[PDB]
Design a protein around this ligand. Structure first.
Ligand SMILES: [Mg+2]
Ligand SMILES: [Mg+2]
Ligand SMILES: [Mg+2]
Ligand SMILES: [Mg+2]
Ligand SMILES: [Zn+2]
Ligand SMILES: [Zn+2]
Ligand SMILES: [Zn+2]
Ligand SMILES: [Zn+2]
Lengths: 193, 241, 97, 185, 115, 261
RNA sequence: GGAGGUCAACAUCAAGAACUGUGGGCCUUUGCCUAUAGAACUUAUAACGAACAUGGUUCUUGCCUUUUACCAGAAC
RNA sequence: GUUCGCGAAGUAACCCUUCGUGGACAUUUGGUCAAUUUGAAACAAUACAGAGAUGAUCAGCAGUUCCCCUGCAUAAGGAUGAACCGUUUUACAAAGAGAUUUA
RNA sequence: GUAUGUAUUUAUUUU
C-alpha cells in the first residue's frame, strides 16, 4: 500500500480515512509499551487491518511492582555512575532525521544490524546471587510453577531471600520513611482542611 | 489522503509532519484551506510519536549509544513544549508541560546530587506517565472530533443547522418576537378584510412610535383608530421597560 | 364519558412500546460505540414458493457504515385526498378602522 | 422504520429455482438508479455456488409506483420492459398511459414520494450487385439467409448491395426479389 | 495554511539563485507581468463632473481604477503617475496627473472639476 | 467452433507491459486520492490506445467457460487483458447463444456486468440507458485516421465495415460524407456495448500504410451512443418494428394468459 | 482427568453497614414478625485502579475588543 | 492421511510387510467492488466586470431560499457569506349626462 | 484582515 495509485484501492482509501478515527488509540497502545532501557527489543502482538489500514499494539504491560522498582533503580545507579564517568557526554540532536529522508524500511536496514548491548548493570556476583539471573529479562519470570502464575503473568508470589535482595537494590527509589507519625500536617486530610 | 481528498494538493506534509504551503496562496485558497484543531492536533500528536520512535530507531542502527538514548527520550518528553507545538491547538496541555517540567526539577536534584551540571540524565518514568495519561484523556475527544470531520467529509454537512440565541444576535430576536406579537393583535382587532398593505403600514407605525419614544416626542398620529393606539402604546411600554 | 381506566393502560402500553422502538432505532445509528449501551426469515415472497432467509452482514468497522447515507435536501409533495370544509357561522367600520 | 417495513418486490423468475435462499440485508444501500434516494439493499445468489450476485437496484416505492421487479425491472406480472407494456396498453384505448418521468434531480427526488402511481402501473473479389431490396431488411437477415441456403456491403440510400464471396467457386454453389449479376475484374 | 505563515515548503533541491535566473528569463514571456499597466483601488479627492452623462462623483468615492507610470519624470528625478477611473453611469475613462511641485492633482480626458 | 471453441485463449499483453497508471501531466502536481492532476488545466487529455484486439487470433476458451459465467472481459474487448486463459471472464465475440443466456439480465445492465444508468449522459458517454434499448453507435472523430485524405468515402465506409464487421452481426451502416460520422446498427444490444468498449480510441488503415508507424500520435475516434434518426423514413421503420414486435409478444401474453384462465 | 491461555461469552461490583434462599405466624401477593442454611470480589485515614485524564451545563472569578482556545473553585 | 478392523498373500508362528476392502475422523471461502480515455473532485490561469444600507466611507446583527463553504461544533467566520434590489390591473359596483338600435 | 462575480467547446448526431 505504500505506492497506491490504482483504482483497485478505491475502498482501501475509504478504509484509511475511517481508521483515522482510531489512530490516537493506537498511539496510546504503542507508546505505553516502550521497551525501557535495560531491555533491548520488546516483541509485541499487533492487530492489523487486513488491508493494512492501521496496526495496533495489543497488550498491556505488566510488571511486578517490587521487581519493577528494583529494575528501574538499578538503571538509576548505572545512570549516575555513567554521568560521573565519561568526560564528553553527547546529547543526540533533534529531530533525528531530516524532513526529506523517508522513514527507512525496517525489513532492510534495521533487522540485520544487531542490538548494540543495553544498560543493565555490573550487578554483583556474591550479594545478588539470587536475583542476578532473571532481573533484566523482558518479562522477569515467565516459566515458573511457584514464582508466578504462568504466561498470562498475573499474581506474582515470591520468597523471603529474593525480597531481601530486591529490597536491597531499590534503596535509591525506596520511600525510606518508616513511621506514620512522620506525616503530621502532610496527610491528605490536612491538605483538604 | 485526507488532505488531497479535500482537494488541497498545495499543502505538503514533510516526513516530520510539518504542514507547509508549497505556494503563496490566493485568498479563496486560505479560506478553503483552513484546517481545524482535529487535523492539526492529530498532526502534532503523531509528530511526537514519530519523534520518539525515531530516537529508538537511531539506537537500533547503532548510531547513538545506550545511555544517550535514555537521555534522549527524557529530553523529548520534557521539551515537547519546544519540539512539537501541540500546545497551540489545545492550550489545556499546558498543565502537563508544567507537570512535566516540575518532575524534571525534582528528578535532577535527587540525581545530580554530588556530581555534575552536565546533560547526563535519563530517568524518564514520571514524564512518560504524565504524557501517557494526558493521552488517555483525548482518546474520546479526538474520536468525537475526527468522527465529525470524516462523516462530514463523506456525507456533507447537516442541512438543517438551526442556530441558538447568544449574546450577539439577541436584540435581533427580541425585535422579531415583538413585531410578530403586534402583528397578531392588530390583525385580530380589525373586523375582516385587509392584510398585507395594512400589515406593513401598521408595523411602520410601530417603529415610528418607538423612535418617537426615544426622542421623548409624544407621537400623536393625526388620526388612527384608538384601540390600535392602545395596543402599540402597550407593547412599546413593554419594550421600554 | 371520561375514558375509563383499563382503556388508558392500553394506549399507554402500545404507545410506550412504539416510542421505545424509535429511540432504540436511533441510538444504534450514530457514530458512538458508547451510545449503544443505553439501548427471522419473515419473508414469504409472492406465493412463498421460494421462501427466503434474511441475514445481516457485519460491516468492516473502518469503512463507512450506511454507505448510502448522504445529507441531501428534498421537497415533499402534499398528497391531498379529501377537502376539509372550512365552515364559519366593513361598511361604515372602515371609517373607524 | 419507514424504509424497512415494506418488503422487497422480486420476480419469481430471476430469483431462481432454489428452495430456500439466503440473502443479505443492508439497512442503507446505494440510492436508486431512479429516485436517487437511499434505501435498504439485498444481495443474493440464485444458485448456492453461482458466481453471479444479484443486487436490487431501485426502491420499494420507486418500484411499487411502476409495479415492476427490483432485480429484473420487468413488469411484475407479464415480465415485460416498462417502455413496452405501456405501449401495448396504449394500443388499447388510443393515446395515453405513457410514463412521463422526472428530468433534473429534485424533480425526480420529489416525484418518487407521491403515492399516485404511474399510468402503465395503474391498470395493474467477386462482386454481385444487389437491387430490388426493401430498405427495411437488415444485412444481418440477408447473409443469414444465404448461409441457411448453403463478405458483404450494402448501401441503404441506394438500395444496392454488393457481395464478394471468398471464391467464385462459391459463386457456382449459390448459383445452385433479387438482381444478382456476376461481375468483377 | 495560516494567513501569517513563517515557512513555505520548498523542493528538496531548489538552488534559489538558479531559480532567480530561470525565473528572470521566465518573466519576459508572461502576459500579466509585462502589462506596463496597473490596477489600484482608490478615491477621488477633488470630486468630479462627467463630460459624457454629466454625472457627478460627489466628493470622495471608492473606485477600482488603473495606475500607470508616466514617461515624464518630475524635475530631474521625481515619479509622476497617471490614474484612470471609469464612470458609473456610462463607460468612460477619466485620467489624473499628480504634480509633485503643486501638491494638488490636475486632470484631463473626460472630466471637469467643480468650484 | 474449429476456430474459437477448441483453441484456448492466449495472453494479449504481458503483465509488466501494461501501461502505467497516473496519466501524464494534465496539471501541475499529482494527486493521491483522486488520480488526476492538481492545479491548472493542460490541453485536454486524450490519446489513441496502444492496444487493439484480433478476434480470431486472440479469442479462445477461458475459465469462465468451464465456470459458466455470463459476462465478458472488457480488457479483452480492449485486447489489454493480461490474465490470459487464467482470466475470470469470457474471451470471444458475443454470439446469439450467449446473449440467449444473458437475455434475462440484459435489461438492467450491459454485457460486461455493469449497471446501466437512467439518463444516458450529457455528451452520450460511456454506458447507455436501461430505459431505451439503443442499438446504434455514433462513430465520430474520424480523424482517428489522422490527416490522410482518401480517394472517396468508400475508403471510410469500406474500412469501418471491415472494422466493426468482425465484432458482431451488423444490421446496417451509414457513413455520412458531409458531417463526419458513421452510424452503425447491430442485431443485439450486447454486440453494441461490446463494440463500443472495443473500438473507442482506435486508429485506421492497414497494419502498414504510409504514416502507420506514427499512428500513436493520433487522437482516436469517439464511439458514443447515438440519438434517434430524424428523417421520416427510418422513423416509419422504427414505428413499424415496434408495432410488429409488440404484436409478437402479445402471443406470449395470450398463451400464458390463456394458461391463466 | 490435571496444568495452564496477554482466549471469548454471560452474570455481578457503592449499600438501612447494606446479600440471597428457605421454614412458620398475621394482614390480604406485597408487607410485618419469627425460625434456619449459605455468603465469592470490593470497602474505615472508607473502596473495584495502593493509580489518574478529558468533556457537557450551571454559577463565581481570572486574562480582557469579540468567538474558539483559555485562567481556578464549586454543584450536578 | 491417521486410526479401528476384516480378508488374501509373503516374512513369519499370531508377531513384521504388501495388497484389497468395510468403518470413523475431516465437510461448501469471496464479491455492493474487474486493471488509465467514455458515469462525472476542486482550484489556478486568461479576458471582462468592480463593493449593503448614503451625498460619501465604514461597524455590524438578523430575517426568507429547492445555494451553500471552512469549522469537532448548538461557537464563529466566509463582502453584514451569497441570492433579495426587479416585473406589477378583474371578489368590482353605485348614480348621473350625451350618442346609436329595438317590442 | 488582502473580496467577489461572469465566460472560457477541442473532437462537426442521419432530413
Ligand atoms: Mg462579529
Ligand atoms: Mg455570519
Ligand atoms: Mg463591509
Ligand atoms: Mg447574512
Ligand atoms: Zn427510489
Ligand atoms: Zn426479477
Ligand atoms: Zn459618465
Ligand atoms: Zn480477460
Amino acid at each position: 500500500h505504500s505506492d497506491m495509485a490504482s483504482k483497485m484501492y478505491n475502498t482501501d482509501k475509504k478504509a484509511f480515512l475511517g481508521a483515522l478515527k482510531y489512530l490516537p488509540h493506537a498511539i496510546l497502545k504503542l507508546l505505553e509499551n516502550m521497551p525501557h532501557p535495560w531491555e533491548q527489543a520488546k516483541e509485541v502482538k499487533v492487530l492489523y487491518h487486513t488491508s493494512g489500514a492501521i496496526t495496533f499494539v495489543n497488550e498491556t504491560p505488566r510488571v511486578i511492582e517490587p521487581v519493577y522498582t528494583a529494575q528501574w533503580s538499578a538503571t538509576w545507579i548505572a545512570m549516575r555512575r555513567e554521568k560521573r564517568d565519561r568526560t564528553h557526554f553527547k546529547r543526540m540532536r533533534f529531530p533525528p532525521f531530516d524532513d526529506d529522508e523517508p522513514p527507512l524500511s525496517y525489513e532492510q536496514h534495521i533487522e540485520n544490524i544487531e542490538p548494540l548491548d543495553p544498560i543493565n548493570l555490573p550487578l554483583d556476583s556474591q550479594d545478588d546471587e539470587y536475583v542476578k539471573d532473571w532481573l533484566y529479562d523482558s518479562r522477569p519470570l515467565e516459566e515458573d510453577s511457584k514464582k508466578v502464575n504462568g504466561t498470562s503473568y498475573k499474581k506474582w508470589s515470591f520468597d523471603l531471600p529474593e525480597m531481601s535482595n530486591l529490597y536491597r537494590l531499590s534503596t535509591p527509589l525506596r520511600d525510606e520513611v518508616t513511621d506514620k507519625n512522620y506525616y503530621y500536617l502532610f496527610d491528605k486530610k490536612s491538605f483538604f482542611n | 489522503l485526507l488532505i488531497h481528498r479535500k482537494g488541497l494538493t498545495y499543502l505538503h506534509l514533510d516526513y516530520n509532519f510539518n504542514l507547509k504551503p508549497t505556494k503563496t496562496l490566493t485568498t479563496k485558497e486560505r479560506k478553503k484551506s483552513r484546517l481545524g484543531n482535529s487535523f492539526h492536533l492529530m498532526r502534532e500528536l503523531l509528530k511526537m510519536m514519530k519523534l520518539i520512535v525515531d530516537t529508538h530507531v537511531q539506537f537500533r542502527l547503532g548510531n547513538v549509544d545506550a545511555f544517550q538514548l535514555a537521555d534522549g527520550i527524557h529530553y523529548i518528553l520534557n521539551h515537547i513544549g519546544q519540539l512539537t507545538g501541540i500546545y497551540r491547538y489545545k492550550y489545556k496541555v499546558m498543565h502537563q508541560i508544567r507537570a512535566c517540567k516540575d518532575l524534571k526539577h525534582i528528578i535532577y536534584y535527587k540525581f545530580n546530587k554530588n556530581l555534575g551540571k552536565g546533560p547526563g540524565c535519563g530517568f524518564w518514568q514520571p514524564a512518560w506517565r504524565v504524557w501517557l495519561n494526558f493521552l488517555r484523556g483525548t482518546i474520546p475527544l479526538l474520536e468525537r472530533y475526527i468522527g465529525n470531520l470524516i462523516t462530514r467529509q463523506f456525507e456533507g454537512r447537516s442541512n438543517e443547522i438551526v442556530k441558538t440565541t447568544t449574546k450577539q444576535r439577541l436584540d435581533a430576536y427580541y425585535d422579531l418576537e415583538l413585531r410578530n406579537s403586534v402583528m397578531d393583535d392588530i390583525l385580530e382587532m380589525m373586523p375582516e378584510s385587509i392584510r398585507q398593505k395594512k400589515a406593513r403600514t401598521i408595523l411602520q407605525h410601530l417603529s415610528e412610535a418607538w423612535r418617537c419614544w426615544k426622542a421623548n416626542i409624544p407621537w400623536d398620529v393625526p388620526g388612527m383608530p384608538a384601540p390600535i393606539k392602545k395596543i402599540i402604546e402597550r407593547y412599546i411600554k413593554s419594550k421600554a421597560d | 364519558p371520561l375514558p375509563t381506566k383499563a382503556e388508558i393502560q392500553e394506549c399507554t402500553a402500545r404507545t410506550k412500546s412504539y416510542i421505545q422502538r424509535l429511540v432504540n432505532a436511533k441510538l444504534a445509528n450514530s457514530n458512538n460505540r458508547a451510545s449503544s449501551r443505553y439501548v427471522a426469515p419473515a419473508n414469504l415472497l409472492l406465493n412463498n414458493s421460494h421462501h427466503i432467509e434474511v441475514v445481516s452482514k457485519q460491516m468492516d468497522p473502518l469503512l463507512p457504515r450506511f454507505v448510502g447515507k448522504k445529507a441531501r435536501k428534498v421537497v415533499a409533495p402534499t398528497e391531498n385526498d379529501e377537502v376539509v370544509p372550512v365552515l364559519h357561522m366593513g361598511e361604515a367600520d372602515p371609517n373607524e378602522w | 422504520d419507514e424504509i424497512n417495513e415494506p418488503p422487497p418486490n422480486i420476480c419469481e423468475q430471476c430469483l431462481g429455482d432454489e428452495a430456500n435462499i439466503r440473502m443479505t440485508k443492508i439497512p442503507q444501500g446505494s440510492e436508486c438508479k431512479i429516485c436517487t434516494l437511499p434505501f435498504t439493499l439485498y444481495h443474493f445468489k440464485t444458485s448456492k455456488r453461482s458466481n453471479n450476485i444479484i443486487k436490487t437496484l431501485i426502491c420499494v416505492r420507486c418500484a411499487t409506483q411502476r409495479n415492476i421487479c427490483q432485480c429484473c425491472m420487468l413488469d411484475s406480472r407479464w415480465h415485460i420492459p416498462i417502455q413496452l407494456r405501456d405501449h401495448l396498453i396504449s394500443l388499447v384505448n388510443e393515446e395515453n398511459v405513457m410514463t412521463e418521468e422526472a428530468k433534473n434531480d429534485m424533480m425526480k427526488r420529489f416525484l418518487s414520494l407521491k403515492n399516485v402511481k404511474l399510468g402503465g402501473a395503474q391498470i395493474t473479389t467477386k462482386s454481385f450487385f444487389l437491387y430490388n431490396i426493401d430498405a427495411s431488411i437488415p444485412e444481418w437477415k440477408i447473409t443469414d439467409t444465404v448461409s441457411q441456403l448453403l463478405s458483404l456491403i450494402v448501401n441503404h440510400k441506394a438500395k444496392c448491395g454488393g457481395l464478394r464471396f471468398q471464391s467464385s467457386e462459391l459463386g457456382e454453389r449459390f448459383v445452385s426479389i433479387f438482381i444478382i449479376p456476376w461481375s468483377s475484374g | 495554511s495560516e494567513r501569517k505563515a513563517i515557512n513555505k515548503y520548498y523542493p528538496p533541491d531548489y538552488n534559489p539563485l538558479e531559480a532567480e535566473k530561470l525565473s528572470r528569463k521566465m518573466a519576459k514571456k508572461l502576459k500579466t507581468m509585462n502589462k506596463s499597466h496597473a490596477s489600484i483601488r482608490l478615491m477621488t479627492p477633488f470630486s468630479m463632473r462627467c463630460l459624457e452623462c454629466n454625472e457627478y462623483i460627489p466628493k470622495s468615492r471608492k473606485f477600482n481604477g488603473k495606475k500607470e507610470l508616466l514617461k515624464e519624470k518630475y524635475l530631474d528625478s521625481i515619479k509622476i503617475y497617471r490614474l484612470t477611473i471609469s464612470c458609473p453611469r456610462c463607460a468612460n475613462s477619466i485620467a489624473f496627473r499628480t504634480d509633485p511641485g503643486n501638491s494638488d492633482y490636475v486632470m484631463e480626458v473626460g472630466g471637469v472639476r467643480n468650484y | 467452433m474449429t476456430s474459437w471453441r477448441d483453441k484456448s485463449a492466449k495472453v494479449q499483453v504481458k503483465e509488466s507491459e501494461l501501461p502505467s497508471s497516473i496519466p501524464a501531466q494534465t496539471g501541475l502536481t499529482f494527486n493521491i486520492w483522486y488520480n488526476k492532476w492538481s492545479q491548472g488545466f493542460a490541453g485536454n487529455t486524450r490519446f489513441v490506445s496502444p492496444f487493439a484486439l484480433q478476434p480470431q487470433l486472440h479469442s479462445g476458451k477461458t475459465r469462465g467457460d468451464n465456470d459458466g459465467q455470463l459476462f465478458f472481459c472488457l480488457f479483452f474487448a480492449k485486447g489489454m487483458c493480461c490474465l490470459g486463459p487464467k482470466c475470470e471472464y469470457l474471451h470471444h465475440i458475443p454470439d446469439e447463444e450467449d446473449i440467449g443466456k444473458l437475455a434475462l439480465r440484459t435489461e438492467v445492465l450491459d454485457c460486461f456486468g455493469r449497471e446501466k444508468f437512467a439518463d444516458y449522459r450529457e455528451d452520450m458517454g460511456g454506458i447507455g440507458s436501461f430505459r431505451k434499448k439503443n442499438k446504434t453507435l455514433y462513430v465520430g472523430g474520424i480523424d482517428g485516421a489522422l490527416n490522410s485524405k482518401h480517394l472517396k468515402p468508400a475508403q471510410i465506409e469500406s474500412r469501418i465495415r471491415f472494422v466493426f464487421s468482425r465484432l458482431g452481426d451488423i444490421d446496417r451502416i451509414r457513413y455520412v460524407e458531409s458531417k463526419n460520422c458513421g452510424f452503425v446498427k447491430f442485431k443485439y444490444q450486447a454486440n453494441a456495448e461490446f463494440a463500443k468498449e472495443a473500438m473507442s480510441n482506435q486508429t485506421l488503415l492497414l497494419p502498414s500504410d504510409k504514416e502507420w508507424d506514427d499512428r500513436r500520435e493520433g487522437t482516436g475516434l469517439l464511439v458514443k451512443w447515438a440519438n434517434e434518426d430524424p428523417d421520416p423514413a427510418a422513423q416509419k421503420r422504427l414505428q413499424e418494428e415496434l408495432k410488429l414486435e409488440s404484436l409478437n409478444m402479445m402471443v406470449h401474453l395470450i398463451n400464458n394468459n390463456t394458461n391463466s384462465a
